[PDB]
Amino acid sequence: LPVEAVKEFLLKLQDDICHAIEAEDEQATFMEDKWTREGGGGGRTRVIANGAVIEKGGVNFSHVYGKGCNYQAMGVSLVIHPKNPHVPTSHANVRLFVAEKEGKEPVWWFGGGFDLTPYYAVEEDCYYFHHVAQELCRPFGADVYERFKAWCDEYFFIPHRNEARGIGGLFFDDLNEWPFEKCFAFMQAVGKGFIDAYIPIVNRRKNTPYTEQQVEFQEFRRGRYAEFNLVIDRGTKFGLQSGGRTESILMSLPPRARWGYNWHPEPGTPEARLTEYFLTKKQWV
Amino acid sequence: MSLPVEAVKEFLLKLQDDICHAIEAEDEQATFMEDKWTREGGGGGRTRVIANGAVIEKGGVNFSHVYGKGGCNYQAMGVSLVIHPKNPHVPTSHANVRLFVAEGKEPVWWFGGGFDLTPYYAVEEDCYYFHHVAQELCRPFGADVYERFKAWCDEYFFIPHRNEARGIGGLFFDDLNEWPFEKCFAFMQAVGKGFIDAYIPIVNRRKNTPYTEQQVEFQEFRRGRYAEFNLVIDRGTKFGLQSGGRTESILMSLPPRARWGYNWHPEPGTPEARLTEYFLTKKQWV
């Protein structure tokens, strides 16, 4: 059971994702923060802030272990919040869980996915994002894209706002229905996919002109993002309740959020278009 | 129904008017706008929000009276409020007073509520004053009332994932039925009136304190902690969202602007750092 190959891949993925983002920003770089746990592994937190293009970003790696026979969990997780409202926020995750025991068969599963959270969406980019997702799933099975794109729509929904968080992507958990080597190949395709799906959107939109009114809209929309993460997100909930590393866990929060009583964009404007059309459309292939 | 619930309702509707009027009198520019609603079974409420004032940037003072099931046939009424001033030198504040009545057996009832102060640039004398008002109003009810409910407040308004108290404390109670109904109701009125005596003089005294954009920035980073408490920990916010309550009324408590930053922390030794260094951990104010 090649757990070491998985770890090597995940460390290389963090590096590659970090370099790709740095190359787009051309100004700020990722500062790294190593940490450990008493007899239970650790990780490398990597954060970027106040760049030309990325306002706030994190790409975290962790490999932790313990018991409850003796488990280990390794993954890469990221959330990118660009400065320019015309570049979408984005999130990705790929992880492996393995629990072993003498006199027993190992138990394991993969999880992860990626998703896009625009403020001023562009149809072209939404199709492109989902096209990358569809193509990477294709060799794994005829229904893999639709299964995991649907799961992504279901998970990233905010019932109390009756709104999707974004335009979707891929989401999966408890993945062990295929042989390990096939699930690991999937992990690699999803991680690779995120770079292919997101970086060209950043490159394309980062120099789009914007105004202070558009940042203000972006900041009200980031209130929705903070709401999903602090109220609904399962990973965030458990980390904060089980004594996880707070700053790593809340890396996902936006740099600035606004809330107003009955705040809403004006119908028929580009601001309202996200909620009128883009979030509800759901058909991107 | 031998219990005087109508009298409690009348008090609560009047308390909302009185809190609203006192806050308006301090702002002098902005007024509360009213959102009335009803729901199936004779329930309803009045949501009142103020925004973009000379003193209050965002504020809400809500009344609610709902009839429900699960337990069984129940009734709940209360007033709830959160005030976020524009000036970093005036603290955020929160209050709540409420009654629950569960109904061929004699009815069961309990009161709940309290109030609390969330400073950004705390002042020693203001924290003393806030707790003093809380201690004075409690005294006629029993020798241990202030200490029990000030400690309950410290326990409830704590953010474990930040190892920080939300603010400098106040009063918090629930399941209150240890006295006859009339005395518990009198306590509800004392706590409601107490909020006005505790908070308004602080607002009046601190509203014209000079401030800077960097003090506002500090305010907004601190308001990230406030959003974290209400969205991750607060029970009333949680139940209100998960059971399909009125989203805009429940999330009224959120700040108008919050900030988050990786390992954000004030410079040690500065006025910003002293909130967490000294004020949030002091606890003993009387």
DSSP reduced 3-state for B87: coil
Contact A68, A88 (CB under 8 A): no
Can you spell out the DSSP letters for B28-65? Answer: SS---EEEEEEETTTEEEEEEEEES-SSEEEEEEEEEE
Q: Which residue has the tokens 């996919």?
A: A193
Q: Do B248 and A258 touch (CB under 8 A)?
A: no
A278 forms bridges with which residues in the sheet?
none
Domain that holds residue B187: 1-286
Q: What residues of chain B, 157 to 196, have a C-beta less than 8 Å from chain A? A: 160-162
Rounded to 10 deg, the angle between the B145-156 and B124-138 helix axes is: 130
Resolution (A): 2.3
- Enclosing H/E stretch for B82: strand B74-85
Is the alpha carbon torsion for B247, B249, B253, B255 positive or negative?
Answer: positive
For residue A47, the chain B residue with the least C-alpha distance is B262
Nearest-Å Rg of the Cα atoms of chain B is 19
Q: How many CB atoms lie within 10 A of CB B226?
A: 21
Tell how far CA B109 is from the center of its chain: 22
Q: Give the contacts of B6 (CB within 8 A, at least 6 positions apart).
A: none
> What are phi and psi for residue B117, nearest 5 degrees?
-115, 130
For residue A236, the chain B residue with the least C-alpha distance is B232
Q: Give the contacts of A132 (CB within 8 A, at least 6 positions apart).
A: A193, A196, A197
| Amino acid code (one letter) for A70 | N
Contact A68, A40 (CB under 8 A): no
> What are phi and psi for residue B54, nearest 5 degrees?
-70, -25
**What determination technique applies here?**
X-ray
Q: Which residue has the tokens 């702002």?
A: B27
Alpha-carbon gap, residue A71 to B57, rounded angstroms = 49
Facing B262 at nearest CB: one of A226, A240, A251: A251
From B69's Cα to the closest Cα of chain A, the distance in A is: 21
Q: B232: which chain A residues are within 8 Å (Cβ-Cβ)?
A: 230-231, 237, 240
Burial of A45 (0-12, 13-18, 19+ CB in 10 A): buried
Q: Kindly report the CATH number assigned to the domain that includes residue A157.
A: 3.40.1500.10
Alpha-carbon gap, residue A160 to A156, rounded angstroms = 12
Contact A90, A23 (CB under 8 A): no
B51 forms bridges with which residues in the sheet?
B58
| Amino acid code (one letter) for A209 | P
Task: Say which of B65, B94, B161, B265 is annotated catalytic.
Answer: B94
A147: contact with B, CB 8 A cutoff: no
In 3D space, the residue among B199, B230, B132, B16 whose CA is nearest the CA of residue A259 turns out to be B230
B65 counts as catalytic = no
Facing B260 at nearest CB: one of A161, A255, A258: A255
**Hey, which bits of A129-200 come out as E strands?**
157-158, 163-164, 168-175
Alpha-carbon gap, residue A60 to A248, rounded angstroms = 7
**Tally of domains within chain B:** 1
Q: Do B256 and A260 touch (CB under 8 A)?
A: yes
Contact A121, A217 (CB under 8 A): no
Contact B84, B57 (CB under 8 A): yes
Alpha-carbon gap, residue A239 to B279, rounded angstroms = 28
For residue B48, the chain A residue with the least C-alpha distance is A261
In 3D space, the residue among B272, B50, B54 whose CA is nearest the CA of residue A260 turns out to be B50
CA atoms within 13 A on the CB side of A176: 10
Is the alpha carbon torsion for B221, A168, A15, A108 positive or negative?
Answer: positive
Give the Å distances, CA to CA, from A112 to A6, A152, A174, A275, B55: 14, 10, 10, 26, 46
Number of helices (H) and strands (E), helices first, in chain B? 9, 10
Burial of B157 (0-12, 13-18, 19+ CB in 10 A): buried
B30: contact with A, CB 8 A cutoff: no
Alpha-carbon gap, residue B23 to B12, rounded angstroms = 17
Q: What share of chain A is helix, strand, coil (3-state, %, to 5)?
A: 45, 25, 25
Contact A168, A284 (CB under 8 A): yes
Alpha-carbon gap, residue A36 to A42, rounded angstroms = 4
